[PDB]
Amino acid sequence: TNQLQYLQKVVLKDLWKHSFSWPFQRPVDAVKLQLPDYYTIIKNPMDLNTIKKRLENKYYAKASECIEDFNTMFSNCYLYNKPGDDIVLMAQALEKLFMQKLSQMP
Amino acid sequence: TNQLQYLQKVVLKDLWKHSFSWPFQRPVDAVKLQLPDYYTIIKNPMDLNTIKKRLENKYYAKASECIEDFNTMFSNCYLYNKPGDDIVLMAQALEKLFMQKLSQMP
Ligand SMILES: CCc1cnn2c(NCc3ccc[n+](O)c3)cc(N3CCCC[C@H]3CCO)nc12
Ligand SMILES: CCc1cnn2c(NCc3ccc[n+](O)c3)cc(N3CCCC[C@H]3CCO)nc12
Ligand SMILES: [Cl-]
């Protein structure tokens, strides 16, 4: 659980502190945010909080499973949205930061 | 050139060999493939061949710059398309294979 501890103590915490992660800290509320077909279009929803619980509850067996989840969160946003959307710009900054943290992993 | 040697000799070559990389081995030809607004929508196009040239011509100073190009090629497909599209399924398999290779970089 060494790389997993990195993902939890370093990667996640660092991403969490940035305000551009705020829309990603909870599953998408399709009603409150008026995204009526969100769950019709996205089949594998993912958010940071789900990722955090999975780390807390020892859900992951290997670090690749966690990294898949992050990847799914970003691509989900790209799929659902289009270039130029605010949320996409936010997703892009999170992802960049993510990849930078990952390159430092043991 | 160490990590950049891995990206060229291991990562690029392994991805190139899969038929699902065929659509990404040349810049999108918007006319022949009848994607009229591709270049209107996508502001930063990227493909394997461009990445390959950049490695050959010693364009990247650093591993992060080349990894950034791969990420752009993936997100570009996601942004331009939508869930369930063939090209998207392809991008996803490419990206997954990409991530596994990355995890084995020095
Ligand atoms: C911290 C407040 C919050 C909670 N949910 N949420 C959402 N949910 C939609 C969503 C989230 C993640 C990925 N995808 O695809 C859709 C969007 C959003 N914002 C949209 C973009 C510009 C900032 C901003 C506006 C309103 O706070 N802010 C929030
Ligand atoms: C290997 C032949 C080829 C060359 N270009 N191209 C494209 N260009 C569009 C494109 C590429 C990369 C990212 N984005 O966003 C759009 C698509 C495509 N296909 C689409 C999906 C299922 C396979 C297949 C069908 C017809 O060969 N095949 C090809
Ligand atoms: Cl999209």
The residue whose two tokens read 């892009």 is: A92
Ligand 1 neighbour A46 (Cβ under 6 A): no
Tell me if A49 is assigned to a ligand binding site.
no
Distance from CA of A106 to the nearest CA of B (A): 10
Entry resolution in angstroms?
Answer: 2.0
Nearest CA in chain B to A43: B83
CATH class for domain A1-105? mainly alpha
- Ligand 2 centroid – CA A73 distance (Å): 24
Between the alpha carbon of residue A102 and those of residues A13, B73, B86, the distances in Å are: 13, 19, 29
Q: Look at residues A83, A96, A68 and name the one whose alpha carbon lies nearest to residue B80.
A: A83
Choose one of A33, A43, A89 to mutate for the ligand 1 pocket test, by most ligand atoms within 8 angstroms of C-beta.
A33
Nearest CA to ligand 1 atom 11: A23
Q: How far apart are CA B92 and CA B69, in angstroms?
A: 16
CB–CB contact B64 A88 (8 Å): no
Look at phi and psi of residue B28 and say left if phi exceeds 0, alpha if psi is from -120 to 50, else beta. Answer: beta
Query: Count H helices, E strands: chain B?
Result: 6, 0
Q: How far apart are CA B44 and CA B13, in angstroms?
A: 23
Q: How far apart are CA B103 and CA B105, in angstroms?
A: 6
Q: Which long-range contacts (CB under 8 A, 24 or more apart) does A55-63 make?
A: A55/A4, A55/A7, A55/A8, A55/A12, A58/A1, A60/A4, A62/A4, A63/A3, A63/A4, A63/A6, A63/A7, A63/A105, A63/B103
Q: Which residue positions of B form the known binding site for JQ1?
A: 81
Nearest CA to ligand 1 atom 3: A23
Ligand 1 neighbour A28 (Cβ under 6 A): yes
Please, which experimental method was used? X-ray
Q: Which residues of A touch B (CB under 8 A)?
A: 41-43, 63-64, 67-68, 71, 74-75, 78-83, 88, 92, 95-96, 99-100, 103
Cβ contact B53:B70 at 8 Å: no
DSSP B44: S
